[PDB]
A paper describes a structure:
Anticancer BH3 peptides have been developed, especially those derived from BIM, which interacts with all of the antiapoptotic proteins with extremely high affinity. Herein, we describe the embedment of the Akt recognition sequence into the BIM BH3 peptide and the cancer cell-specific apoptogenic property of the resulting BIM BH3 peptide variant characterized by X-ray crystallography, calorimetry and cell-based biochemistry.
The peptide binds to the BH3-binding groove of BCL-XL by forming an amphipathic α-helix, as observed in all of the reported structures of the BH3 peptides bound to the antiapoptotic BCL-2 family proteins, 15, 31. The p-BH3BIM(I155R/E158S) peptide contains four of the five consensus residues that are highly conserved in the BH3 domains of the proapoptotic proteins and known to have critical roles in interacting with the antiapoptotic BCL-2 proteins. The four residues (Ile148, Leu152, Asp157 and Phe159) in the peptide are involved in the intermolecular hydrophobic or hydrophilic interactions with BCL-XL, similar to the corresponding residues of the BIML BH3 bound to BCL-XL (not shown). The remaining consensus residue, which corresponds to Ile155 of human BIM (Ile97 of mouse BIM), is replaced by arginine in p-BH3BIM(I155R/E158S). While Ile97 of mouse BIM is involved in hydrophobic interactions with Phe97 and Tyr101 of BCL-XL, Arg155 of p-BH3BIM(I155R/E158S) forms a hydrophobic interaction with Tyr101 through its hydrocarbon portion, and makes an intramolecular salt bridge with Glu151 of the peptide through its guanidinium group. The salt bridge is likely to increase the helical propensity of p-BH3BIM(I155R/E158S) in solution and to contribute to the binding affinity of this phosphorylated peptide.
Numbering used by the authors:
A (entry chain A): -1 to 31, 83 to 196
B (entry chain B): 145 to 163
The structure:
């Protein structure tokens, strides 16, 4: 539906932004082709990175990421992150995490992971974050708070 | 991941409080 599609598009926008910010291009990894929401998310993401990038500088080594272990590892991290609840900050961390994982993957010859991560992010957002989001003011409220 | 997820929780929570 329009809802699921918009969340998938939001993920593409954020990751494309993040990937391009690092000298990469979305088209290099996927054939899948500014609203205030997208703008606010890109901005929150940058802010989170400017604050914690260094501590999250080597995700693939810390998690021992390989094409064969990425699937389960990603899911375990996101499940633990939201195991007891959700807030906008954790959602931003979720995005930054996914974005950082995408960049590192291509930098470390695992570009095949970009499309998968994008889908994993969008699927988790739609199935396990959307409910909290719509019950907490929706993305519009996120824009008002982090805009 | 557990360790990474918990770093994201504490930092996401710190980030949340700031805004
Ligand atoms: Cl740390
Ligand atoms: Cl906990």
């Amino acid at each position: 539906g329009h809802m699921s599609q918009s969340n998938r598009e939001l993920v593409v926008d954020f990751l494309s932004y993040k990937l391009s910010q690092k000298g990469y291009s979305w088209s290099q990894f996927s054939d899948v082709e500014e609203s205030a929401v997208k703008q606010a998310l890109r901005e929150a993401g940058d802010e989170f990175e400017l604050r914690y990038r260094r501590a999250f500088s080597d995700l693939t080594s810390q998690l021992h990421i390989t094409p064969g272990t990425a699937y389960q590892s990603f899911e375990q991290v996101v499940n633990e992150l939201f195991r007891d609840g959700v807030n906008w900050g954790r959602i931003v961390a979720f995005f930054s995490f996914g974005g950082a994982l995408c960049v590192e993957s291509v930098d470390k010859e695992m570009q095949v992971l970009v499309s998968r991560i994008a889908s994993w992010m969008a699927t988790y957002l739609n199935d396990h974050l959307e409910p909290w989001i719509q019950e907490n003011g929706g993305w519009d409220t996120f824009v008002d708070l982090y805009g | 991941x557990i360790w990474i997820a918990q770093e994201l929780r504490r930092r996401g929570d710190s980030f949340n409080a700031y805004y």
